């Protein structure tokens, strides 16, 4: 990958606003899930937060 996350968004993103997701590289200083919204915003997210892990599973089930 080509970007790394420094801090996580503290709050809920509604599922309907999520378009896609990816995981940053393990070579980053922190691990992260990046969510891309339907408006094209990229949001660094806590990969250990249950809500985030669940949203990734939600997006994977639509695929």
């Amino acid at each position: 990958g080509r970007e790394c996350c420094l801090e996580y968004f503290k709050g809920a993103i509604p599922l309907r606003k999520l378009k896609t997701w990816y995981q940053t590289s393990e070579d980053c200083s922190r691990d992260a899930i990046v969510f891309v919204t339907v408006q094209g915003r990229a949001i660094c997210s806590d990969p250990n937060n249950k809500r985030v892990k669940n949203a990734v599973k939600y997006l994977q089930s639509l695929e």
């Binding site: 990958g1 080509r2 970007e3 790394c4 996350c5 420094l6 801090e7 996580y8 968004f9 503290k10 709050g11 940053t24 590289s25 070579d27 980053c28 200083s29 992260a32 990046v34 915003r41 990229a42 949001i43 660094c44």
Partner: protein
């Protein structure tokens, strides 16, 4: 979404260590600065945008100080990921 929650561009080197491209960027219409001491490359974001993934480029090494990648007067191979 906060002004520090945007992904930040990086480049890898031949030891696979990632380093940030500059030390500041716009994030959700605010200013995002990396912490002092962070390893960085003295490379403009708009140049990074033109970098072809996985070709080798030449990057000036730096360290972040008050949101600027300050040059350390050393160069090393750097590459953009997929």
């Amino acid at each position: 979404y906060g002004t520090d929650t945007c992904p930040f561009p990086v480049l890898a080197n031949k030891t696979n260590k990632a380093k940030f491209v500059g030390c500041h960027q716009k994030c959700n219409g605010g200013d995002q600065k990396l912490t002092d001491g962070t390893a960085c490359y003295v490379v403009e974001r708009k140049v990074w945008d033109r970098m072809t993934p996985m070709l080798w480029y030449e990057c000036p090494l730096g360290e972040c100080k008050n949101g600027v990648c300050e040059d350390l007067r050393k160069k090393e191979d750097c590459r953009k990921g997929n």
